[PDB]
Amino acid sequence: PKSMQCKVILLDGSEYTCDVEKRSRGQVLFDKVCEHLNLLEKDYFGLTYRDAENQKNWLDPAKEIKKQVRSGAWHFSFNVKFYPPDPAQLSEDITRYYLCLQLRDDIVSGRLPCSFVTLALLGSYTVQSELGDYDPDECGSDYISEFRFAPNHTKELEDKVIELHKSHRGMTPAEAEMHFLENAKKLSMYGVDLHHAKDSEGVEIMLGVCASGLLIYRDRLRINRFAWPKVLKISYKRNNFYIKIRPGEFEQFESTIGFKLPNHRAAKRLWKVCVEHHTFFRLL
Numbered sequence: 001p002k003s004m005q006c007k008v009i010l011l012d013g014s015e016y017t018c019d020v021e022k023r024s025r026g027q028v029l030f031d032k033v034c035e036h037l038n039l040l041e042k043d044y045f046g047l048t049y050r051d052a053e054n055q056k057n058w059l060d061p062a063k064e065i066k067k068q069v070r071s072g073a074w075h076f077s078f079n080v081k082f083y084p085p086d087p088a089q090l091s092e093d094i095t096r097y098y099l100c101l102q103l104r105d106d107i108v109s110g111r112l113p114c115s116f117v118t119l120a121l122l123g124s125y126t127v128q129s130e131l132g133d134y135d136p137d138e139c140g141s142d143y144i145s146e147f148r149f150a151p152n153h154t155k156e157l158e159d160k161v162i163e164l165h166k167s168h169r170g171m172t173p174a175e176a177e178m179h180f181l182e183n184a185k186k187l188s189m190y191g192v193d194l195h196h197a198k199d200s201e202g203v204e205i206m207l208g209v210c211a212s213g214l215l216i217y218r219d220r221l222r223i224n225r226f227a228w229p230k231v232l233k234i235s236y237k238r239n240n241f242y243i244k245i246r247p248g249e250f251e252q253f254e255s256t257i258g259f260k261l262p263n264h265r266a267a268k269r270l271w272k273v274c275v276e277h278h279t280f281f282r283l284l
Contacts, residue, residue: 004065008033008047009077011101016078020065027061033078041095043280046081057269058276082280083191085211087181093174100126100177103184110151112189120157121183123149124164128176134166188222193277195270197241197259207241207259209273211281214243216257228281234274236267 003019006029010016018032026047034042047059049069058081059068080102090096104126106112107119114122126147131138144158168176184190192208192215199205199216208215214231216224226245232254233244243257261267 004074006032006074006076009075010037011078011098011105022066024065025061025063026059026065026068029059029065029076030061037078037098038094039098041090041092044080044082044084044090044095045098046079047076048079049076051265053263053265055265055269058272080191082277082284083185083211084284085185085191085281087185088178093177096174096177096181100129100180100184103180103190104148108148108151111194112184112187114150114187116157117160118183118187119150120160121164122180123147123157123161124168125171125176125180125183127161127165128168128171129173129180133169134162193273195261195266195273197261197270200258200260202260205259207270209270209277211277211284214274228278231278234271234278236261236264236271239264239267241267241270 002022004022004024006018006020008016008018008029010033016033016036018029018036020028020032030042030045030047033047034040034045039045046061048056049059049072051057052071057068059065059076065074080099084090084099087096087099090099103112103122107114107122123145126149127145130147139162143162144153144155145161149161150157171179189208190210192210194217195207195209197205197207203218206217206220208217213225213227213229215222216226226243230246231243232246233242235242235244239261241259241261243259245255245257247254261270
């Protein structure tokens with residue numbers, strides 16, 4: 001038995017260190033992390049690693065870790081893989097807590113755009129969960145939270161978080177986390193995994209993968225939507241990705257939409273993400 005050291009960045013930003021046998025599959029590491037987190041509703045989560053091209057990949061739990069990280073370090077992050085469209089239906093408050101931590105990072109990173117007022121509201125619920133009730137002993141006219149809320153901050157934003165925090169008196173952490181999620185789940189980019197591609201005409205677009213289906217964005221603007229029920233088949237070949245769309249009721253044939261990805265690995269990654277999301281959300 002040869003022990004490999006694993007480092008996993010947890011969603012509170014702390015680093016978890018453990019050992020797994022050199023021939024271990026991803027599931028073994030994932031199970032250690034989830035036991036450390038006291039997490040039972042594991043199916044929404046996964047581990048990511050960075051490949052030699054610096055691209056984010058999901059660690060496949062069925063495959064040897066060594067055949068995935070290959071030349072790279074055994075360094076991972078714990079992340080939400082499948083964002084639930086209805087977080088109130090999760091069985092456990094701790095599952096909602098980890099989803100809130102992920103969404104906080106999605107907002108601060110700029111991956112999840114959000115209006116000024118919604119940033120403030122979400123921030124207010126975070127403060128209520130972490131600090132409890134508004135405390136004027138701790139909060140003067142010059143207050144800036146130690147909590148990061150947004151990609152960048154203004155004093156007007158900090159003041160709005162305070163104003164809204166005042167309104168939450170008596171709210172428990174689990175209640176504030178549920179309010180956070182009821183608001184976050186309505187954001188247009190909630191749970192949307194974005195992939196750079198060109199359309200068949202060579203025009204740069206973004207392809208989004210999420211619970212409801214596939215999104216084609218033309219220039220930071222939603223254009224085209226394919227709900228999972230409309231998607232017959234998806235495939236890749238070389239650096240091409242193909243979506244087959246079910247015919248309308250009385251149409252004879254499916255339509256094919258083709259995209260060019262930056263390389264073969266990118267085309268494969270997109271296909272895998274799509275198959276996983278289609279399967280998970282068809283069955284959930």
